[PDB]
Design a protein around this ligand. Structure first.
Ligand code: FAD
Ligand code: FAD
Ligand code: K25
Ligand code: K25
Ligand code: ZN
Ligand code: ZN
Lengths: 230, 230
């Protein structure tokens, strides 16, 4: 035991399917004795825009603004905005980061994209060197728990949407793997709006049950072959 | 040949490489006699978050907030927030929509993701049915003009990042094609920060040159094969 979990949660509605998946996670991980923290992005009115307000005090170059460089330097100089550093503290302490969100345009909702853009800066999440297998959050686990409008059928290799794995690439590989996370198998709850309550309860239950043994899981091989191969 | 272009632009710094790419597009398309509009999202302080503030009318279900449902109904009733309808007007009038942005986490910056999330609502951009080749923005063209930190070699199949086309899938297919756009080949200006001044000028001029003949181009086949190969 002694395991710490951050849930980064992106849904506007407490009563939503996403809300229930988040609450089941809190309940089950809490029951196990895990340390659990939730960043409820919409309730926080979390700022998604990458702007020069994310740096407090004097900028590295106040005439030409380069976000990547300014935030790298601000992290090194402990001069990032408190909303960012608050999130970095949560991530730093976590052994597992679970992202709970509805799929928006084959990706995360903008509020959560903004969390990734602003929280995962150079020096904290990655550096030269220290990316992919050697990214700075190595040792940590990340897990995408996604809900969709589309059915599993639509999300097949020859379905209209392609394999669900195809849209996971920028998230699992380009973001989480890049930062050094070992990536647990995604949790994809397909088309809850379409499903019967029976099927919905089953999807929630699968998640709760999965969570019972989450600490015994092996990470996926987060490779192009995993995402795009046969 | 009275063509209308919307450039949706997502960079904080007017002197940036992205800023130059946006400006040369304006210069060249204006020179051609095109009608040109730019949505400079950061300068507009464009709202990225999908929230209940985006609907001003009586909600369909005020007890359980479903963003998709409420925005679809609000579009039909004309009770969407005016920032959304302002953008929809620009898209409706445009023959070509160019997106100009730096790659953030294998995707668009959150401010631009928010534009996609909030502007491309059901009833305006797609219906059920009425998506992919039957999407509501059929007859229009879209083009991603992207800049990266990574080099072209890093973005090949055997490179660490995988092929560049891999990260285009959620944007070109999941978003643009879903809404009925035909998609012109991407413009990817690789690693300008690493490039010499002359190589930078070369990349800007290549884009300007391409734009001279943009109206003669055919779209890509926006399929899984195009993106991922056999
Ligand atoms: C901007 C935007 C972009 C989108 N892009 C995509 C896309 O690219 N691809 C795609 O596939 N979809 C897309 N969607 C659709 C979206 O992913 C789904 O609408 C979303 O995933 C549904 O999840 P939800 O939590 O909102 O469901 P909800 O509507 O909140 O819930 C579904 C039903 O489950 C019920 N429920 C809640 N809790 C429980 C419980 N504990 N047990 C049983 N039932 C319960 C709820 O009451 C509800 O009736 C998009 C939607 C929007 C708004
Ligand atoms: C949050 C975040 C996430 C990122 N994620 C990724 C990612 O997933 N993958 C990836 O590859 N990269 C990523 N990057 C890096 C990012 O994509 C690059 O920094 C960006 O694309 C560079 O474009 P720019 O316009 O900001 O370059 P700039 O720094 O503005 O341009 C480089 C140089 O070009 C000069 N210049 C400007 N105009 C001209 C001109 N007309 N002629 C000649 N020179 C000119 C500028 O003065 C500058 O010196 C990320 C960065 C951030 C901040
Ligand atoms: C709102 N709703 C039910 C919904 N929105 C969708 C979007 Br946007 C995409 Br892309 C896809 Br694919 C599917 Br399937 C969607 N289903
Ligand atoms: C800031 N900078 C230059 C930068 N950031 C990057 C990110 Br984030 C990713 Br993922 C990749 Br891949 C590359 Br290459 C990046 N290069
Ligand atoms: Zn990977
Ligand atoms: Zn397509």
């Amino acid at each position: 035991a002694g395991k710490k979990v951050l849930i980064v949660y992106a849904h506007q509605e407490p009563k939503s399917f996403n809300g229930s998946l988040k609450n089941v996670a809190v309940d089950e991980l809490s029951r196990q004795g895990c340390t659990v923290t939730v960043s409820d992005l919409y309730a926080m009115n979390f700022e998604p825009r990458a702007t020069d307000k994310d740096i407090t005090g004097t900028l590295s170059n106040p005439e030409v603004f380069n976000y990547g460089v300014e935030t790298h330097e601000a992290y090194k100089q402990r001069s990032l905005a408190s909303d960012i550093t608050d999130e970095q503290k949560k991530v730093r302490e976590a052994d597992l980061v679970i992202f709970q969100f509805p799929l928006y345009w084959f990706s995360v909702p903008a509020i959560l994209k903004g969390w990734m853009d602003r929280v995962l800066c150079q020096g904290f999440a990655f550096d030269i060197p220290g990316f992919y297998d050697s990214g700075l959050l190595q040792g940590k686990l990340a897990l995408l728990s996604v809900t969709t409008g589309g059915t599993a059928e639509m999300y097949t290799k020859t379905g209209v949407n392609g394999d669900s794995r195809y849209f996971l690439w920028p998230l699992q590989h380009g973001t989480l793997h890049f930062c050094g996370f070992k990536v647990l198998a995604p949790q994809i709850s397909f088309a809850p709006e379409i499903a019967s309550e029976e099927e919905r309860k089953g999807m929630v239950a699968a998640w709760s049950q999965r969570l019972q043994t989450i600490w015994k899981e092996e990470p996926i091989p987060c490779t192009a072959h995993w995402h795009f191969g046969q």
